[PDB]
């Protein structure tokens, strides 16, 4: 998680889309969904990122509807956005033990217990937190077994990005699980 504000420049695709849905939270605007293979993914927007400005105008106080409308009405040749990086999230680095475990239990992507004497215990992983990313890869909407599988196929060093569940549950309201599973970018970013 970068302690930064960064500028991104976007271009609507040939369908006039950027591949973004946005959500009003605490009088800011946050990214609720980034579509795979979209202008938003390509420029590196992530679930939970805060949008500070669009085209030099402050997003403060905007409703979700107003943010969507602003994007629709932008001359989509060059849209500038000022982003603060995933401000409700934190990243925790763990090491798999000899048995290949880091030491927690989760359910519906939410961490529910920390295993004694684990790497998770040593690094202070918290319960009541939703898993947003593993090793920089968005895992939101994937099944527990797929998240398990990613953890298995990772190396020893496992980086997890988490968000307090009450904030996660606020961000994802009015978005169908099937959309999150099917449409949220789960790819590794391209170079």
């Amino acid at each position: 998680i970068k302690q930064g504000i960064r500028e991104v420049i976007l271009c609507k695709d040939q369908d006039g889309k950027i591949g973004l849905r946005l959500k009003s939270i605490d009088n800011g605007i946050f990214v609720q969904l980034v579509q795979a293979n979209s202008p938003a993914s390509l420029v590196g927007l992530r679930f939970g990122d805060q949008v500070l400005q669009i085209n030099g105008e402050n997003c403060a106080g905007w409703s979700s509807d107003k943010a969507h409308k602003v994007l629709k009405q932008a001359f989509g040749e060059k849209i500038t956005m000022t982003i603060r990086d995933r401000p409700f999230e934190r990243t925790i680095t763990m090491h798999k033990d000899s048995t290949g475990h880091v030491g927690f239990i989760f359910k519906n992507g939410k961490i529910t217990s920390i295993v004694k004497d684990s790497s998770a215990a040593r690094n202070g992983l918290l319960t009541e937190h939703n898993i947003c990313e593993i090793n920089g890869q968005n895992v939101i909407g994937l099944k527990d077994s797929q998240i398990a599988d990613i953890l298995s196929t990772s190396g020893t060093v496992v980086t997890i990005t988490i968000m307090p569940a009450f904030i996660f549950e606020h961000i994802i309201k009015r978005m169908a699980p099937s959309i999150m599973k099917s449409l949220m970018d789960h790819t590794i970013p391209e170079v």
Side-chain angles (χ1 to χ4, degrees), residues 77-146:
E77 188 224 2
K78 190 211 201 200
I79 310 172
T80 71
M81 284 178 90
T82 302
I83 299 301
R84 192 186 290 268
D85 181 37
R86 293 170 292 161
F88 296 129
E89 292 161 71
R90 281 193 284 120
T91 294
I92 305 275
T93 293
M94 282 154 328
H95 298 241
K96 298 174 176 185
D97 66 6
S98 55
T99 84
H101 293 126
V102 288
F104 67 94
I105 298 167
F106 69 100
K107 193 205 162 178
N108 299 139
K110 195 177 78 176
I111 305 159
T112 50
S113 83
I114 310 306
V115 180
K116 280 174 177 195
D117 309 309
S118 66
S119 189
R122 282 190 293 282
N123 286 277
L125 194 65
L126 296 186
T127 55
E128 200 61 8
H129 278 67
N130 279 87
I131 302 160
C132 296
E133 306 175 358
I134 296 173
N135 299 330
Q137 158 173 353
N138 181 308
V139 298
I140 288 161
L142 300 180
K143 300 172 170 169
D144 291 345
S145 53
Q146 293 178 292

Side-chain angles (χ1 to χ4, degrees), residues 18-53:
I18 57 157
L20 213 48
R21 290 276 282 185
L22 296 182
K23 184 72 148 66
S24 179
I25 309 279
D26 297 343
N27 279 279
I29 291 292
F30 293 80
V31 174
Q32 174 194 55
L33 191 129
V34 180
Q35 197 167 25
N37 310 300
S38 73
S41 60
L42 292 167
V43 301
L45 290 185
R46 279 175 293 283
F47 179 83
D49 276 343
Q50 188 179 355
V51 187
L52 291 196
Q53 280 95 43

